From Swiss-Prot, chain A:
Disulfide-bonded cysteines: C6-C11
Interval of the full protein contained in this chain: 88 to 108 of 108
Highest taxon above the source species: Eukaryota
The organism of origin for this protein: Sus scrofa (Pig)
Listed name of the protein: Insulin A chain
Gene: INS
Amino acid sequence: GIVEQCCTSICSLYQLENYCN
Amino acid sequence: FVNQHLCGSHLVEALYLVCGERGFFYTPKA
């Protein structure tokens, strides 16, 4: 989920935008 | 500013800045 992809490993804009409504 | 380890309130704040008026969903445990 988001923690694993952005906290535990380096985030990206592509990934953050997947959580926008 | 988003290509880094973003954890806790730091991650929430990045979602807030990037998503804007669209809003977002934050599900840590999933």
